[PDB]
Design a protein around this ligand. Structure first.
Ligand SMILES: O=C(O)CCC[C@@H]1c2ccccc2C[C@H]1NC(=O)c1cc2cc(F)ccc2[nH]1
Length: 578
Protein backbone atom coordinates (compact mmCIF):
# COMPACT_ATOMS: atom_id res chain seq x y z
CA UNK A 1 0.00 0.00 0.00
CA UNK A 2 1.37 3.34 -1.20
CA UNK A 3 -1.12 5.87 0.07
CA UNK A 4 -0.33 4.24 3.44
CA UNK A 5 3.45 4.28 3.28
CA UNK A 6 3.40 7.99 2.46
CA UNK A 7 0.87 8.83 5.20
CA UNK A 8 3.04 7.14 7.83
CA UNK A 9 6.21 8.80 6.50
CA UNK A 10 5.03 12.39 5.96
CA UNK A 11 2.45 12.45 8.72
CA UNK A 12 -1.11 13.68 8.39
CA UNK A 13 -0.24 17.40 8.46
CA UNK A 14 2.19 17.44 5.49
CA UNK A 15 0.41 14.59 3.69
CA UNK A 16 -2.80 16.74 3.66
CA UNK A 17 -0.90 19.78 2.32
CA UNK A 18 0.95 17.99 -0.44
CA UNK A 19 -2.27 16.45 -1.72
CA UNK A 20 -3.75 20.01 -1.83
CA UNK A 21 -0.89 21.20 -4.02
CA UNK A 22 -1.06 18.12 -6.26
CA UNK A 23 -4.68 18.77 -7.05
CA UNK A 24 -4.11 22.53 -7.38
CA UNK A 25 -1.22 22.14 -9.83
CA UNK A 26 -3.33 19.71 -11.93
CA UNK A 27 -6.63 21.69 -11.89
CA UNK A 28 -5.78 25.35 -11.64
CA UNK A 29 -9.04 26.93 -12.75
CA UNK A 30 -10.93 24.76 -10.21
CA UNK A 31 -12.19 26.58 -6.97
CA UNK A 32 -10.74 26.25 -3.41
CA UNK A 33 -13.72 24.63 -1.72
CA UNK A 34 -13.67 21.72 -4.20
CA UNK A 35 -10.00 20.91 -3.78
CA UNK A 36 -10.44 21.00 0.01
CA UNK A 37 -13.43 18.66 -0.23
CA UNK A 38 -11.36 16.27 -2.36
CA UNK A 39 -8.17 16.29 -0.28
CA UNK A 40 -10.23 15.43 2.81
CA UNK A 41 -11.76 12.36 1.12
CA UNK A 42 -8.25 11.11 0.24
CA UNK A 43 -7.13 11.71 3.86
CA UNK A 44 -10.14 9.88 5.24
CA UNK A 45 -9.20 7.10 2.80
CA UNK A 46 -5.46 7.04 3.61
CA UNK A 47 -6.17 6.50 7.28
CA UNK A 48 -8.22 3.38 6.45
CA UNK A 49 -5.23 1.94 4.60
CA UNK A 50 -3.11 2.69 7.72
CA UNK A 51 -5.57 0.78 9.86
CA UNK A 52 -5.64 -1.96 7.19
CA UNK A 53 -3.18 -2.10 4.24
CA UNK A 54 -5.11 -5.00 2.64
CA UNK A 55 -8.22 -2.85 2.51
CA UNK A 56 -10.02 -2.35 -0.80
CA UNK A 57 -8.20 0.14 -3.07
CA UNK A 58 -5.17 0.60 -0.84
CA UNK A 59 -2.96 -1.18 -3.36
CA UNK A 60 -3.88 1.25 -6.14
CA UNK A 61 -1.12 3.62 -7.16
CA UNK A 62 -1.25 7.22 -5.98
CA UNK A 63 -1.93 8.66 -9.48
CA UNK A 64 -4.80 6.17 -9.88
CA UNK A 65 -6.37 7.36 -6.64
CA UNK A 66 -5.44 11.02 -7.03
CA UNK A 67 -6.58 11.08 -10.67
CA UNK A 68 -9.89 9.31 -10.15
CA UNK A 69 -10.59 11.86 -7.40
CA UNK A 70 -9.62 14.92 -9.45
CA UNK A 71 -11.83 13.79 -12.37
CA UNK A 72 -14.89 13.76 -10.09
CA UNK A 73 -14.90 17.53 -10.77
CA UNK A 74 -12.69 17.88 -13.92
CA UNK A 75 -14.80 16.00 -16.53
CA UNK A 76 -17.13 19.01 -16.49
CA UNK A 77 -15.78 20.72 -19.63
CA UNK A 78 -18.49 23.42 -19.62
CA UNK A 79 -16.00 24.81 -17.10
CA UNK A 80 -12.63 23.36 -18.06
CA UNK A 81 -13.37 21.28 -21.14
CA UNK A 82 -9.84 20.09 -21.97
CA UNK A 83 -9.28 18.45 -18.59
CA UNK A 84 -12.08 16.04 -19.47
CA UNK A 85 -9.61 14.60 -22.00
CA UNK A 86 -7.18 13.20 -19.41
CA UNK A 87 -10.13 11.91 -17.42
CA UNK A 88 -11.00 9.66 -20.41
CA UNK A 89 -7.56 7.98 -20.27
CA UNK A 90 -6.29 5.29 -17.85
CA UNK A 91 -2.86 5.65 -16.26
CA UNK A 92 -0.10 6.44 -17.19
CA UNK A 93 -1.70 8.25 -20.20
CA UNK A 94 -3.92 10.39 -17.96
CA UNK A 95 -1.10 11.70 -15.68
CA UNK A 96 0.88 12.41 -18.87
CA UNK A 97 -2.14 14.31 -20.12
CA UNK A 98 -2.55 16.29 -16.87
CA UNK A 99 1.13 17.39 -17.07
CA UNK A 100 0.61 18.19 -20.71
CA UNK A 101 -2.00 20.81 -19.72
CA UNK A 102 -0.25 22.62 -16.81
CA UNK A 103 -0.74 26.30 -17.64
CA UNK A 104 2.28 28.51 -16.96
CA UNK A 105 0.14 31.60 -17.71
CA UNK A 106 -3.36 30.78 -16.47
CA UNK A 107 -6.19 33.32 -16.90
CA UNK A 108 -6.43 33.97 -13.16
CA UNK A 109 -6.98 37.22 -11.33
CA UNK A 110 -4.26 39.15 -9.64
CA UNK A 111 -4.67 38.16 -6.00
CA UNK A 112 -5.77 41.18 -3.97
CA UNK A 113 -5.04 40.89 -0.26
CA UNK A 114 -7.36 42.60 2.22
CA UNK A 115 -6.27 44.89 5.07
CA UNK A 116 -4.16 43.57 7.93
CA UNK A 117 -7.07 43.56 10.44
CA UNK A 118 -9.41 41.67 8.11
CA UNK A 119 -6.57 39.23 7.42
CA UNK A 120 -5.75 38.74 11.10
CA UNK A 121 -9.46 38.26 11.78
CA UNK A 122 -9.45 35.40 9.28
CA UNK A 123 -6.27 33.89 10.83
CA UNK A 124 -7.49 33.58 14.42
CA UNK A 125 -11.08 32.74 13.41
CA UNK A 126 -9.78 29.64 11.57
CA UNK A 127 -6.04 29.42 10.89
CA UNK A 128 -6.40 25.98 9.22
CA UNK A 129 -8.53 27.37 6.36
CA UNK A 130 -6.40 30.52 6.11
CA UNK A 131 -3.22 28.51 5.49
CA UNK A 132 -4.90 26.03 3.13
CA UNK A 133 -5.86 29.12 1.13
CA UNK A 134 -2.22 30.23 0.90
CA UNK A 135 -1.08 26.81 -0.43
CA UNK A 136 -4.01 26.86 -2.87
CA UNK A 137 -3.34 30.29 -4.45
CA UNK A 138 0.41 29.85 -4.95
CA UNK A 139 0.33 26.31 -6.39
CA UNK A 140 -2.49 26.96 -8.89
CA UNK A 141 -0.51 30.01 -10.11
CA UNK A 142 2.75 28.03 -9.95
CA UNK A 143 2.03 24.46 -11.14
CA UNK A 144 5.75 23.47 -10.90
CA UNK A 145 6.37 24.90 -7.43
CA UNK A 146 8.69 22.59 -5.54
CA UNK A 147 6.18 21.17 -3.16
CA UNK A 148 8.45 20.43 -0.21
CA UNK A 149 9.50 24.12 -0.30
CA UNK A 150 5.90 25.29 -0.53
CA UNK A 151 5.52 23.61 2.90
CA UNK A 152 8.55 25.45 4.30
CA UNK A 153 7.08 28.82 3.20
CA UNK A 154 3.63 27.99 4.54
CA UNK A 155 5.33 27.61 7.90
CA UNK A 156 6.88 31.07 7.44
CA UNK A 157 3.47 32.41 6.33
CA UNK A 158 1.80 30.98 9.48
CA UNK A 159 4.54 32.31 11.76
CA UNK A 160 4.22 35.83 10.41
CA UNK A 161 0.50 36.20 11.24
CA UNK A 162 1.07 34.36 14.49
CA UNK A 163 3.64 36.97 15.50
CA UNK A 164 2.42 40.03 13.63
CA UNK A 165 -1.29 39.79 14.61
CA UNK A 166 -0.30 40.43 18.26
CA UNK A 167 2.14 43.29 17.50
CA UNK A 168 1.07 46.76 18.62
CA UNK A 169 1.45 47.87 14.97
CA UNK A 170 0.45 44.81 12.98
CA UNK A 171 1.06 46.23 9.53
CA UNK A 172 4.66 47.33 10.11
CA UNK A 173 5.40 43.83 11.39
CA UNK A 174 3.40 41.96 8.74
CA UNK A 175 3.88 43.69 5.35
CA UNK A 176 7.71 43.43 5.20
CA UNK A 177 7.41 39.69 5.88
CA UNK A 178 4.58 38.99 3.46
CA UNK A 179 6.44 40.83 0.69
CA UNK A 180 9.69 38.99 1.40
CA UNK A 181 7.74 35.71 1.10
CA UNK A 182 6.03 36.85 -2.09
CA UNK A 183 9.42 37.76 -3.55
CA UNK A 184 11.28 34.74 -2.20
CA UNK A 185 8.38 32.59 -3.49
CA UNK A 186 8.46 33.81 -7.08
CA UNK A 187 12.20 33.04 -7.19
CA UNK A 188 11.87 29.46 -5.94
CA UNK A 189 9.19 28.89 -8.54
CA UNK A 190 11.43 30.09 -11.38
CA UNK A 191 14.44 28.07 -10.18
CA UNK A 192 12.14 25.03 -10.05
CA UNK A 193 10.73 25.60 -13.54
CA UNK A 194 14.24 25.36 -15.01
CA UNK A 195 14.71 22.06 -13.22
CA UNK A 196 11.52 20.64 -14.66
CA UNK A 197 12.33 21.92 -18.11
CA UNK A 198 15.80 20.29 -17.99
CA UNK A 199 14.27 16.95 -17.07
CA UNK A 200 11.14 17.05 -19.26
CA UNK A 201 12.50 18.68 -22.44
CA UNK A 202 16.19 17.61 -22.44
CA UNK A 203 16.31 14.41 -20.30
CA UNK A 204 17.95 13.44 -17.00
CA UNK A 205 21.46 13.20 -18.43
CA UNK A 206 21.15 16.98 -18.58
CA UNK A 207 19.80 17.23 -15.02
CA UNK A 208 22.64 15.02 -13.77
CA UNK A 209 25.32 17.10 -15.49
CA UNK A 210 23.87 20.34 -14.06
CA UNK A 211 23.51 18.60 -10.70
CA UNK A 212 27.04 17.20 -10.83
CA UNK A 213 28.58 20.57 -11.62
CA UNK A 214 26.37 22.35 -9.10
CA UNK A 215 26.69 20.03 -6.07
CA UNK A 216 30.47 19.80 -6.64
CA UNK A 217 30.86 23.62 -6.57
CA UNK A 218 29.39 23.47 -3.09
CA UNK A 219 31.16 20.33 -1.80
CA UNK A 220 34.66 20.43 -3.34
CA UNK A 221 36.13 18.36 -0.47
CA UNK A 222 33.78 15.46 -1.29
CA UNK A 223 34.76 12.46 -3.41
CA UNK A 224 33.13 12.05 -6.82
CA UNK A 225 31.52 8.76 -5.76
CA UNK A 226 29.76 10.64 -2.93
CA UNK A 227 28.56 13.47 -5.16
CA UNK A 228 27.34 10.89 -7.69
CA UNK A 229 25.22 9.50 -4.82
CA UNK A 230 23.87 12.90 -3.89
CA UNK A 231 23.14 13.53 -7.62
CA UNK A 232 21.36 10.25 -8.28
CA UNK A 233 19.32 11.11 -5.18
CA UNK A 234 18.65 14.71 -6.14
CA UNK A 235 17.71 13.51 -9.63
CA UNK A 236 15.11 11.10 -8.30
CA UNK A 237 13.57 13.76 -6.11
CA UNK A 238 13.12 16.39 -8.85
CA UNK A 239 12.12 13.78 -11.43
CA UNK A 240 9.33 12.88 -9.00
CA UNK A 241 8.23 16.45 -8.32
CA UNK A 242 8.29 17.15 -12.08
CA UNK A 243 6.14 14.05 -12.83
CA UNK A 244 3.48 15.06 -10.27
CA UNK A 245 4.61 12.42 -7.73
CA UNK A 246 4.68 14.79 -4.80
CA UNK A 247 4.40 12.61 -1.70
CA UNK A 248 7.32 10.52 -2.81
CA UNK A 249 9.32 13.65 -3.81
CA UNK A 250 8.72 15.30 -0.41
CA UNK A 251 9.61 12.14 1.48
CA UNK A 252 12.76 11.43 -0.62
CA UNK A 253 13.94 14.99 -0.15
CA UNK A 254 13.55 14.44 3.60
CA UNK A 255 15.65 11.26 3.41
CA UNK A 256 18.25 13.12 1.37
CA UNK A 257 18.51 15.73 4.13
CA UNK A 258 18.78 13.07 6.87
CA UNK A 259 21.52 11.38 4.84
CA UNK A 260 23.38 14.62 4.11
CA UNK A 261 23.46 15.42 7.82
CA UNK A 262 24.43 11.89 8.92
CA UNK A 263 27.45 12.13 6.62
CA UNK A 264 28.53 15.79 6.96
CA UNK A 265 32.11 14.70 7.49
CA UNK A 266 32.08 13.16 3.95
CA UNK A 267 30.26 16.13 2.37
CA UNK A 268 30.94 19.56 3.86
CA UNK A 269 31.64 21.68 6.98
CA UNK A 270 29.13 24.51 6.37
CA UNK A 271 26.27 22.17 7.33
CA UNK A 272 26.50 21.85 11.16
CA UNK A 273 23.99 24.71 11.72
CA UNK A 274 21.48 23.58 9.03
CA UNK A 275 21.35 20.10 10.52
CA UNK A 276 20.41 21.42 13.96
CA UNK A 277 17.38 23.12 12.36
CA UNK A 278 13.86 21.67 12.30
CA UNK A 279 12.77 19.19 9.68
CA UNK A 280 11.19 21.57 7.13
CA UNK A 281 13.88 24.26 7.45
CA UNK A 282 16.60 21.56 7.42
CA UNK A 283 16.47 20.97 3.63
CA UNK A 284 15.89 24.56 2.44
CA UNK A 285 18.83 25.58 4.61
CA UNK A 286 21.06 23.02 2.93
CA UNK A 287 20.12 24.21 -0.58
CA UNK A 288 20.97 27.84 0.24
CA UNK A 289 24.36 27.41 1.94
CA UNK A 290 27.70 28.94 0.90
CA UNK A 291 30.42 26.81 -0.71
CA UNK A 292 32.91 24.84 1.36
CA UNK A 293 36.60 25.74 1.35
CA UNK A 294 38.38 24.40 -1.71
CA UNK A 295 40.84 21.64 -0.71
CA UNK A 296 44.22 23.44 -0.34
CA UNK A 297 46.12 21.03 -2.63
CA UNK A 298 44.61 19.92 -5.88
CA UNK A 299 46.56 18.49 -8.82
CA UNK A 300 46.35 20.24 -12.20
CA UNK A 301 43.33 19.38 -14.37
CA UNK A 302 45.46 18.64 -17.45
CA UNK A 303 47.24 15.57 -16.05
CA UNK A 304 44.22 13.23 -15.79
CA UNK A 305 42.34 14.72 -18.78
CA UNK A 306 44.99 15.60 -21.38
CA UNK A 307 48.52 14.47 -20.53
CA UNK A 308 47.57 10.96 -19.41
CA UNK A 309 47.65 8.14 -21.95
CA UNK A 310 44.64 5.94 -22.75
CA UNK A 311 42.24 8.86 -22.20
CA UNK A 312 40.19 7.23 -24.94
CA UNK A 313 40.40 3.92 -23.05
CA UNK A 314 38.53 5.43 -20.09
CA UNK A 315 36.29 7.41 -22.43
CA UNK A 316 35.44 4.13 -24.16
CA UNK A 317 34.96 1.91 -21.07
CA UNK A 318 32.66 4.38 -19.27
CA UNK A 319 32.26 7.74 -21.03
CA UNK A 320 29.53 9.00 -18.73
CA UNK A 321 31.71 8.24 -15.72
CA UNK A 322 34.71 9.75 -17.52
CA UNK A 323 32.89 12.96 -18.48
CA UNK A 324 31.29 13.14 -15.03
CA UNK A 325 34.74 13.04 -13.50
CA UNK A 326 35.87 15.89 -15.75
CA UNK A 327 32.77 17.85 -14.87
CA UNK A 328 33.35 17.11 -11.18
CA UNK A 329 37.05 17.98 -11.14
CA UNK A 330 36.60 21.10 -13.27
CA UNK A 331 33.63 22.37 -11.31
CA UNK A 332 35.08 21.80 -7.79
CA UNK A 333 38.10 23.88 -8.78
CA UNK A 334 35.97 26.62 -10.38
CA UNK A 335 33.21 28.02 -8.10
CA UNK A 336 33.43 31.34 -10.03
CA UNK A 337 32.40 29.62 -13.26
CA UNK A 338 28.63 29.67 -13.81
CA UNK A 339 27.15 26.18 -13.89
CA UNK A 340 26.24 26.53 -17.57
CA UNK A 341 29.78 27.60 -18.49
CA UNK A 342 30.99 24.41 -16.84
CA UNK A 343 28.47 22.49 -18.93
CA UNK A 344 29.65 24.04 -22.25
CA UNK A 345 33.25 23.35 -21.28
CA UNK A 346 32.29 19.76 -20.49
CA UNK A 347 30.51 19.50 -23.86
CA UNK A 348 33.44 21.03 -25.80
CA UNK A 349 35.61 18.34 -24.14
CA UNK A 350 33.30 15.49 -25.23
CA UNK A 351 33.15 16.69 -28.85
CA UNK A 352 36.94 16.99 -29.04
CA UNK A 353 37.47 13.48 -27.66
CA UNK A 354 35.09 12.09 -30.34
CA UNK A 355 37.20 13.82 -33.00
CA UNK A 356 40.62 12.94 -31.54
CA UNK A 357 40.20 9.28 -30.56
CA UNK A 358 40.11 8.56 -34.29
CA UNK A 359 43.45 7.36 -34.69
CA UNK A 360 46.44 9.38 -35.61
CA UNK A 361 47.98 11.41 -32.78
CA UNK A 362 45.13 12.04 -30.33
CA UNK A 363 47.72 12.73 -27.63
CA UNK A 364 48.42 15.69 -29.92
CA UNK A 365 45.13 17.03 -31.32
CA UNK A 366 43.53 17.05 -27.84
CA UNK A 367 46.56 18.81 -26.29
CA UNK A 368 45.16 22.26 -27.07
CA UNK A 369 41.66 21.50 -25.68
CA UNK A 370 42.10 23.88 -22.79
CA UNK A 371 43.01 26.51 -25.39
CA UNK A 372 39.53 25.90 -26.85
CA UNK A 373 37.94 26.82 -23.45
CA UNK A 374 39.36 30.37 -23.30
CA UNK A 375 36.77 32.17 -25.51
CA UNK A 376 33.82 30.54 -23.73
CA UNK A 377 35.10 31.84 -20.37
CA UNK A 378 35.47 35.49 -21.43
CA UNK A 379 32.48 35.91 -23.72
CA UNK A 380 30.00 35.93 -20.74
CA UNK A 381 32.33 37.82 -18.40
CA UNK A 382 32.46 40.63 -20.93
CA UNK A 383 28.64 40.78 -20.98
CA UNK A 384 28.30 40.82 -17.19
CA UNK A 385 30.98 43.53 -16.86
CA UNK A 386 29.31 45.51 -19.64
CA UNK A 387 25.76 44.97 -18.37
CA UNK A 388 26.91 45.84 -14.85
CA UNK A 389 28.55 48.94 -16.29
CA UNK A 390 25.17 50.02 -17.66
CA UNK A 391 23.33 49.11 -14.44
CA UNK A 392 24.97 51.57 -12.04
CA UNK A 393 24.53 54.45 -14.52
CA UNK A 394 20.84 53.71 -15.17
CA UNK A 395 19.48 52.28 -11.88
CA UNK A 396 17.25 49.18 -11.86
CA UNK A 397 14.23 50.81 -13.56
CA UNK A 398 15.96 52.56 -16.52
CA UNK A 399 18.08 49.44 -17.10
CA UNK A 400 14.92 47.32 -17.53
CA UNK A 401 13.66 49.83 -20.09
CA UNK A 402 16.95 49.40 -21.97
CA UNK A 403 16.61 45.60 -21.86
CA UNK A 404 12.96 45.91 -22.96
CA UNK A 405 14.06 47.96 -25.98
CA UNK A 406 16.92 45.53 -26.55
CA UNK A 407 14.74 42.39 -26.19
CA UNK A 408 11.69 43.89 -27.95
CA UNK A 409 13.85 44.66 -30.99
CA UNK A 410 15.54 41.31 -30.58
CA UNK A 411 12.32 39.20 -30.75
CA UNK A 412 9.34 41.57 -31.58
CA UNK A 413 6.73 38.90 -32.38
CA UNK A 414 6.62 38.02 -28.66
CA UNK A 415 3.49 38.82 -26.59
CA UNK A 416 3.87 42.21 -24.89
CA UNK A 417 3.09 41.15 -21.32
CA UNK A 418 5.70 38.44 -21.83
CA UNK A 419 8.32 40.96 -22.98
CA UNK A 420 7.64 43.09 -19.90
CA UNK A 421 7.61 40.41 -17.18
CA UNK A 422 10.72 38.94 -18.76
CA UNK A 423 12.67 42.14 -19.35
CA UNK A 424 12.03 43.20 -15.77
CA UNK A 425 13.30 39.89 -14.30
CA UNK A 426 16.27 40.19 -16.65
CA UNK A 427 16.79 43.72 -15.33
CA UNK A 428 16.80 42.36 -11.77
CA UNK A 429 20.28 40.87 -12.43
CA UNK A 430 21.97 44.25 -11.82
CA UNK A 431 20.82 44.63 -8.22
CA UNK A 432 21.42 40.97 -7.29
CA UNK A 433 24.81 40.37 -8.89
CA UNK A 434 26.54 43.73 -9.67
CA UNK A 435 26.67 44.20 -5.86
CA UNK A 436 29.22 41.34 -5.65
CA UNK A 437 32.90 41.22 -6.65
CA UNK A 438 33.77 39.28 -9.84
CA UNK A 439 34.51 36.06 -7.88
CA UNK A 440 30.76 35.47 -7.35
CA UNK A 441 29.38 37.66 -10.21
CA UNK A 442 29.35 35.18 -13.11
CA UNK A 443 27.54 32.23 -11.53
CA UNK A 444 25.13 34.61 -9.76
CA UNK A 445 24.21 36.32 -13.01
CA UNK A 446 24.55 33.87 -15.84
CA UNK A 447 22.66 31.21 -13.89
CA UNK A 448 20.08 33.71 -12.68
CA UNK A 449 19.56 34.63 -16.33
CA UNK A 450 19.22 30.96 -17.30
CA UNK A 451 16.18 30.91 -15.02
CA UNK A 452 14.73 34.06 -16.58
CA UNK A 453 15.21 32.87 -20.21
CA UNK A 454 13.66 29.44 -19.50
CA UNK A 455 10.82 31.52 -18.11
CA UNK A 456 10.61 33.23 -21.50
CA UNK A 457 10.98 29.90 -23.25
CA UNK A 458 7.95 28.35 -21.53
CA UNK A 459 5.59 31.39 -21.68
CA UNK A 460 6.43 31.43 -25.42
CA UNK A 461 6.11 27.68 -26.05
CA UNK A 462 2.44 27.92 -25.06
CA UNK A 463 1.65 30.06 -28.17
CA UNK A 464 4.75 30.28 -30.40
CA UNK A 465 5.10 33.33 -32.68
CA UNK A 466 8.80 34.11 -33.31
CA UNK A 467 11.01 31.43 -34.83
CA UNK A 468 14.10 32.85 -33.19
CA UNK A 469 12.69 32.28 -29.69
CA UNK A 470 11.67 28.72 -30.57
CA UNK A 471 15.17 28.17 -31.95
CA UNK A 472 17.17 29.46 -28.96
CA UNK A 473 14.92 27.43 -26.61
CA UNK A 474 14.86 24.10 -28.45
CA UNK A 475 18.44 24.21 -29.75
CA UNK A 476 20.37 23.56 -26.53
CA UNK A 477 19.47 24.17 -22.87
CA UNK A 478 23.02 25.11 -21.92
CA UNK A 479 23.45 27.52 -24.85
CA UNK A 480 20.19 29.52 -24.52
CA UNK A 481 21.78 32.73 -23.30
CA UNK A 482 24.60 33.07 -25.79
CA UNK A 483 21.86 32.32 -28.34
CA UNK A 484 19.72 35.29 -27.25
CA UNK A 485 22.81 37.43 -26.62
CA UNK A 486 23.88 37.03 -30.27
CA UNK A 487 20.53 37.93 -31.83
CA UNK A 488 20.07 41.41 -33.34
CA UNK A 489 17.14 43.65 -34.45
CA UNK A 490 14.74 41.59 -36.65
CA UNK A 491 14.82 42.83 -40.25
CA UNK A 492 11.99 40.52 -41.39
CA UNK A 493 9.58 42.10 -38.89
CA UNK A 494 6.64 44.06 -40.33
CA UNK A 495 5.43 46.59 -37.67
CA UNK A 496 1.80 46.99 -36.61
CA UNK A 497 0.83 50.45 -37.84
CA UNK A 498 -0.88 51.97 -34.77
CA UNK A 499 -3.69 51.93 -32.20
CA UNK A 500 -5.71 54.53 -30.27
CA UNK A 501 -7.15 52.49 -27.37
CA UNK A 502 -3.70 51.22 -26.25
CA UNK A 503 -2.22 54.54 -24.99
CA UNK A 504 -5.06 56.77 -23.73
CA UNK A 505 -5.19 55.74 -20.04
CA UNK A 506 -7.89 55.85 -17.34
CA UNK A 507 -8.12 57.36 -13.85
CA UNK A 508 -7.57 54.03 -12.04
CA UNK A 509 -3.88 54.52 -12.92
CA UNK A 510 -3.54 56.94 -9.99
CA UNK A 511 -4.88 54.41 -7.49
CA UNK A 512 -2.40 51.67 -8.45
CA UNK A 513 1.03 50.98 -6.92
CA UNK A 514 4.25 52.47 -8.29
CA UNK A 515 5.07 48.79 -8.94
CA UNK A 516 2.05 48.44 -11.28
CA UNK A 517 2.34 52.00 -12.51
CA UNK A 518 5.89 51.32 -13.78
CA UNK A 519 4.43 48.21 -15.44
CA UNK A 520 1.80 50.30 -17.27
CA UNK A 521 4.53 52.69 -18.47
CA UNK A 522 6.76 49.79 -19.49
CA UNK A 523 3.94 48.23 -21.55
CA UNK A 524 3.42 51.56 -23.32
CA UNK A 525 7.12 51.56 -24.24
CA UNK A 526 7.00 48.04 -25.65
CA UNK A 527 4.08 48.83 -27.97
CA UNK A 528 5.81 51.98 -29.39
CA UNK A 529 8.92 49.98 -30.29
CA UNK A 530 6.68 47.40 -31.93
CA UNK A 531 5.20 50.30 -33.96
CA UNK A 532 8.54 52.00 -34.60
CA UNK A 533 11.83 50.09 -34.37
CA UNK A 534 13.50 51.23 -37.64
CA UNK A 535 14.14 54.51 -35.87
CA UNK A 536 14.91 53.95 -32.19
CA UNK A 537 17.54 56.38 -30.87
CA UNK A 538 17.26 58.22 -27.54
CA UNK A 539 13.85 59.24 -28.98
CA UNK A 540 12.65 56.12 -27.13
CA UNK A 541 14.09 57.26 -23.77
CA UNK A 542 12.88 60.74 -24.84
CA UNK A 543 9.17 59.99 -25.52
CA UNK A 544 9.04 57.83 -22.36
CA UNK A 545 9.57 61.04 -20.38
CA UNK A 546 6.49 62.34 -22.22
CA UNK A 547 4.22 59.60 -20.69
CA UNK A 548 5.61 59.50 -17.10
CA UNK A 549 4.93 63.24 -16.77
CA UNK A 550 1.44 62.85 -18.31
CA UNK A 551 0.77 60.11 -15.71
CA UNK A 552 1.77 62.10 -12.60
CA UNK A 553 0.41 65.47 -13.85
CA UNK A 554 -3.07 64.02 -14.43
CA UNK A 555 -2.88 62.15 -11.09
CA UNK A 556 -2.38 65.56 -9.43
CA UNK A 557 -4.51 67.66 -11.84
CA UNK A 558 -7.74 67.59 -9.79
CA UNK A 559 -10.02 66.89 -12.77
CA UNK A 560 -12.71 64.36 -13.68
CA UNK A 561 -10.80 62.21 -16.22
CA UNK A 562 -10.57 65.29 -18.48
CA UNK A 563 -6.92 65.37 -19.51
CA UNK A 564 -6.88 61.56 -19.93
CA UNK A 565 -9.26 61.85 -22.94
CA UNK A 566 -8.32 65.37 -24.14
CA UNK A 567 -4.60 65.84 -23.37
CA UNK A 568 -4.05 62.09 -23.78
CA UNK A 569 -5.03 62.39 -27.46
CA UNK A 570 -2.69 65.33 -28.20
CA UNK A 571 0.36 63.26 -27.17
CA UNK A 572 -0.10 59.79 -28.75
CA UNK A 573 -0.28 61.20 -32.30
CA UNK A 574 2.53 63.76 -31.83
CA UNK A 575 5.33 61.16 -31.61
CA UNK A 576 4.18 59.38 -34.78
CA UNK A 577 5.59 62.55 -36.36
CA UNK A 578 8.01 63.23 -33.47
O1 LIG B 1 16.09 19.53 -3.70
C1 LIG B 1 16.34 20.61 -3.22
O2 LIG B 1 16.52 20.75 -1.87
C2 LIG B 1 16.45 21.80 -4.14
C3 LIG B 1 17.71 21.71 -4.99
C4 LIG B 1 18.89 22.37 -4.29
C5 LIG B 1 20.26 21.82 -4.73
C6 LIG B 1 21.21 21.44 -3.62
C7 LIG B 1 20.94 20.64 -2.52
C8 LIG B 1 21.95 20.38 -1.60
C9 LIG B 1 23.22 20.92 -1.80
C10 LIG B 1 23.48 21.70 -2.93
C11 LIG B 1 22.46 21.96 -3.83
C12 LIG B 1 22.54 22.77 -5.08
C13 LIG B 1 21.04 22.95 -5.45
N1 LIG B 1 20.71 22.88 -6.88
C14 LIG B 1 21.17 21.94 -7.78
O3 LIG B 1 21.90 21.05 -7.46
C15 LIG B 1 20.68 22.03 -9.15
C16 LIG B 1 20.37 20.98 -9.98
C17 LIG B 1 19.91 21.48 -11.16
C18 LIG B 1 19.47 20.85 -12.30
C19 LIG B 1 19.05 21.65 -13.35
F1 LIG B 1 18.62 21.08 -14.47
C20 LIG B 1 19.06 23.04 -13.25
C21 LIG B 1 19.50 23.65 -12.07
C22 LIG B 1 19.93 22.84 -11.04
N2 LIG B 1 20.39 23.17 -9.82
Amino acid sequence: SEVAHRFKDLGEENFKALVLIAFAQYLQQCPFEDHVKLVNEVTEFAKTCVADESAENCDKSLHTLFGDKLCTVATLRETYGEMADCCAKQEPERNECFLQHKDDNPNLPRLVRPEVDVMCTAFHDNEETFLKKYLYEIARRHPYFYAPELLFFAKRYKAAFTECCQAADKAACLLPKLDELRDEGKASSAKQRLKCASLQKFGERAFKAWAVARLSQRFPKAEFAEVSKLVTDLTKVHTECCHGDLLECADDRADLAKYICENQDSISSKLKECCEKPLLEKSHCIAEVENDEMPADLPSLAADFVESKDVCKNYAEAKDVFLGMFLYEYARRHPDYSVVLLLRLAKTYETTLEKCCAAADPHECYAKVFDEFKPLVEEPQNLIKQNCELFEQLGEYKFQNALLVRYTKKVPQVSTPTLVEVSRNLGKVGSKCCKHPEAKRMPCAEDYLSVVLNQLCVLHEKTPVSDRVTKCCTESLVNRRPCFSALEVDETYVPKEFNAETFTFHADICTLSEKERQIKKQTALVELVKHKPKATKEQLKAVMDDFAAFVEKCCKADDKETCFAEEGKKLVAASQAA
